[PDB]
């Protein structure tokens with residue numbers, strides 16, 4: 734997900 | 743004051759929408775700007791939440807879930823405070839470049855929600871909410887909406903919510919009367935966030951018909967997470983009934 738990609742940065 | 747020191751230190755700064763104010767207002771441009779501002783505010787909410795006392799104790803999937811479910815209420819409550827602090831609630835201060843007078847409230851097709859947000863803003867004044875109460879109440883809003891089927895580690899969420907409630911009791915400490923006032927105000931956020939979720943959802947479904955742009959993360963969250971709230975699978979935690 735785009736959110737999870739952002740979060741896991 | 744270690745806890746409050748941290749909340750002050752992590753509080754986001756100013757976030758702009760990028761709206762073109764040097765053009766007559768239109769529904770499509772106002773809403774495309776609100777959507778862009780919502781994406782930029784979500785990035786700041788992530789950085790803020792990750793830095794909260796105890797938040798990293800939650801399961802990572804629960805950290806992500808609670809941010810996505812609570813984002814709209816967090817944004818409503820912070821915008822109501824900016825509106826009170828910057829313009830004495832005379833307009834809705836979404837951003838320094840996105841300030842809604844009543845005409846814009848009407849033009850946005852979100853008029854009822856906006857009036858309810860202006861009322862919330864006024865309450866900050868009426869109830870003499872302190873900046874420290876504001877910061878503790880906003881943090882508690884992160885921990886105020888969850889799935890009926892349970893979080894991955896629900897017990898760790900319950901403990902962290904309880905600790906935030908304890909910090910609010912310590913800030914208040916006549917204590918009961920104030921607790922009643924603040925929890926009524928917190929509960930009032932939830933129906934406004936409910937109505938904004940409904941509007942956002944409906945707008946996404948018709949967005950091609952009305953020329954409104956949604957950024958990728960906004961379109962994902964409104965299509966994947968928001969409908970869990972609208973369909974009653976994810977529910978607020980109310981203090982009063984409700």
Ligand SMILES: CC(C)(O)C(=O)Nc1ccc([N+](=O)[O-])c(C(F)(F)F)c1
Pocket residue numbers: 773776777778779780783814816817818819820821835836837938942
């Ligand atoms: C329409 C939708 C999804 O863009 C939206 O509700 N955007 C939005 C953006 C920013 C903010 N804000 O707090 O500054 C808010 C709101 F929380 F006030 F309502 C909504």
